């Protein structure tokens, strides 16, 4: 991640803003560029672009603006104290108190990042924009999904690259990030998948636009210059001369996973899927006979499986991802 953050981001941001958004950032990066990863994520998909737009327009039709959506459904901005308090309550509820170091960061291009610093798990939380009703969801995403799946994975024969090849695993993504995104919005009253949708949309446009064009295009959905800056940089991570079209397509994984998981939710065993580790929903049957399940942990929010399934239905309705639409999307 650190590798894809431009090392001159601040200087370029000031140039952009002081130009009244007409300048195209010329980003630079810590040598060497991770070629393989850039290449892997150099193309945008349009497969779910209509679902993304559907999500965004559903928010805007109910709330008028992102700004109002955020305040009305997000609640108040939290102090550091309030963050630490909510996090501590979460770790206890999740039976993982004392396992993860928690750090508060200003450098983050997202709300949160789970890492391995000093060979040890670390949750970095962005202090800017952490919100009362939303923070719990970030914890369900980062700790209840990424962290638990990671620990469960470490117990499996596919715990490393060779194990994945030997047992014939499909990639973890987009199942990983799909599951995490659903989990973020799981117990919200208005579980719109705004971030997943806008990420997907931004990348799709970035593939054909300059930074300047993209920043302007987003005005239609979000006014705040600072927010738009963040979405633009994310969609163009790795791009040096942003006057040209190009994207880093990774963040399309969120909506991609959401749609596939919701589409197939009736045949997916969610506790097993989490227990098997970093695995695709498609490999569950394949891997079930070989999984080591004795000491695997399932998130607290999956104990009541009927309620969990009801929440998935609520998420579907809220986001206009109805059964018949999913079925036409993926005739699987």
> Which residue positions form the known binding site for Zn(2+)?
141, 146, 177
Instruction: Reply yes or no on whether 57 is catalytic.
Output: no
Q: What span, in angstroms and rounded, lies between the C-alpha atoms of 22 and 54?
A: 29
If you ran DSSP here, which 8-state letter would residue 42 be given?
-
Q: Token pair for residue 298?
A: 């399932």
**Cβ-proximal residues to 310 (8 Å cutoff; 6+ apart), any chain:** none
Annotated binding site: 141, 146, 177
Per-position b or e across 113-124, b if 16+ CB within 10 A of its CB: bbeeeeeebebb
Distance of CA 255 to the CA centre of its chain: 9
Return the C-alpha torsion angle 199, 204, 221, 5, nearest 10. 50
| b/e map 212-241, b = 16+ CB within 10 Å | bbbbebbeebbeeeebbbbbbbbbbbbbee
**Of 117, 142, 282, 313, which one is the catalytic site residue?**
142
Identify the CA nearest to 75 among candidates 126, 134, 128: 134
CB atoms within 10 A of CB 184: 26
Residues with active-site annotation? 142
């Amino acid at each position: 991640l650190v590798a894809l953050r431009p090392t001159n981001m601040d200087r370029e941001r000031d140039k952009f803003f002081q130009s009244h958004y007409t300048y195209n950032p010329q980003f630079e990066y810590q040598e060497p560029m991770p070629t393989a990863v850039l290449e892997k994520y150099c193309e945008a998909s349009g497969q779910f672009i209509h679902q993304a737009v559907g999500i965004i327009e559903a928010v805007l039709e109910k709330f008028g603006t992102y700004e109002h959506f955020e305040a009305a459904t997000g609640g108040q901005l939290l102090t550091k104290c309030q963050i630490w308090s909510i996090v501590r309550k979460y770790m206890q509820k999740e039976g993982c108190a004392g396992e993860v170091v928690v750090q508060l960061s200003e450098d983050l291009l997202s709300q949160a990042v789970m890492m391995v610093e000093n060979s040890r798990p670390t949750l970095a939380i962005n202090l800017t924009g952490a919100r009362q009703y939303w923070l719990e969801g970030m914890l369900r995403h980062e700790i209840g999904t990424h962290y638990l799946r990671g620990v469960n994975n470490a117990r499996q024969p596919w715990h490393n690259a060779e194990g994945r090849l030997r047992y014939g695993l499909r990639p973890a993504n987009p199942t990983e990030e799909g599951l995490a995104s659903l989990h973020s919005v799981l117990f919200r009253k208005q579980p719109f998948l705004w971030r997943a949708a806008l990420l997907y949309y931004t990348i799709h446009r970035a593939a054909r636009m300059s930074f300047r064009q993209l920043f302007q295009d987003l005005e239609r959905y979000v006014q705040d210059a600072d927010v738009r800056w963040e979405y633009c940089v994310r969609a163009k991570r790795g791009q040096t001369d942003t006057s040209l079209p190009g994207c880093f397509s990774k963040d399309q994984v969120y909506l991609d996973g959401i749609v596939r998981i919701l589409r197939h939710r009736q045949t997916i065993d969610f506790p097993l899927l989490t227990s098997l580790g970093k695995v695709s929903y498609e490999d569950v049957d394949h891997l079930r006979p070989h999984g080591v399940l004795d000491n695997t942990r399932v998130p607290h929010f999956m104990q009541d499986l009927a309620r969990y399934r009801q929440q998935l239905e609520h998420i579907m309705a809220t986001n206009r991802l109805d059964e018949a639409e999913l079925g036409r999307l993926l005739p699987d």
